[PDB]
Design a binder for these strands. Structure first.
Ligand SMILES: [Zn+2]
Length: 252
DNA sequence: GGTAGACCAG
DNA sequence: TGGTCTA
């Protein structure tokens, strides 16, 4: 899921779990659990805690309990569902939180790529994976100035820069390619080569792209197809070890 | 600072 | 392929 999907999950999941008390935690793929390392300690500490809130940072979901926060990342195919303990689990269900009212929060993930960390609330923000996470793209903490500051200090491509989680939180491949197209910037441009005007434009399109999504595509996955703005076939190469889509005419 | 390790299965 | 951590 992308940041906008994660925000949707945050919004819709919360009322389904708030105020419920955890009675059991069942884990079928231990490797999902990253902290505490021992998945049995993970399970034991959450029992008896009540869900008090649900926040998002980047693509991370932060479940607030009584004493702890559960930090969860779905990666590409992780999904949460709330349902009855009386019904069979869906395929690829790896973690289940059982509540005292007979309902469950289920985590499914065909790729088994997602991660979970639990810490005392007051520690969550200064421990992995939230530590070092950059500002929310939709927040004033993410500004042209901040972006400019990071751009000049590096020799990497502009795409690599925007993919950097310390620069800005949860900006995925798709939104990077779309935003660069919209800003008229080639993804392979060295970040330091960007003018001040290009930085402001990029910031503006980044916010617009992610902002519109939280509420179609120009280039992502459209290789071999005409650009919607100029008709030139969209091209695909590899930049920053990633599938990279761009229009060689609109972007410079 | 930096990229190339690591995890997964359709 | 993807995202984010550790080495
Ligand atoms: Zn074009």
């Amino acid at each position: 899921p992308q940041l906008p999907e994660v925000e949707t999950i945050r919004r819709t999941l919360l009322p389904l779990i708030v105020g419920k008390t955890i009675e059991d935690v069942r884990i079928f793929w231990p490797n999902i659990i990253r902290h505490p390392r021992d998945s049995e300690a993970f399970a034991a500490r959450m029992i008896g805690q009540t869900v008090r809130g649900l926040e998002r940072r980047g693509k991370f979901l932060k479940f607030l309990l009584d004493r702890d926060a559960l930090i969860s990342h779905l990666r590409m195919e992780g999904r949460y569902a709330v349902a009855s303990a009386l019904e069979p689990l869906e395929p690829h269900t790896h973690v289940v939180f059982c509540f005292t009212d007979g309902s469950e929060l289920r985590y499914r993930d065909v790729r088994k790529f997602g991660t979970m960390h639990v810490y005392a609330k007051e520690e969550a923000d200064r421990r992995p994976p939230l530590a070092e996470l950059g500002p929310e793209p939709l927040s004033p903490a993410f500004s042209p100035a901040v972006l400019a500051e990071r751009a000049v200090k590096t020799k990497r491509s502009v795409k690599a820069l925007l993919l950097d989680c310390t620069v800005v939180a949860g900006f995925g491949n798709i939104y990077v390619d779309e935003s660069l197209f919209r800003a008229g910037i080639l993804p392979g441009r060295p970040a330091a080569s960007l003018s001040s005007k290009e930085i402001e434009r990029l910031h503006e399109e980044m916010v617009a792209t992610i902002g519109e999504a939280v509420m179609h595509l120009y280039v992502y996955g459209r290789q071999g197809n005409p650009c919607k703005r100029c008709g030139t076939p969209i091209e695909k190469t590899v930049v920053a070890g990633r599938g990279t889509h761009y229009c060689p005419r609109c972007q410079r």
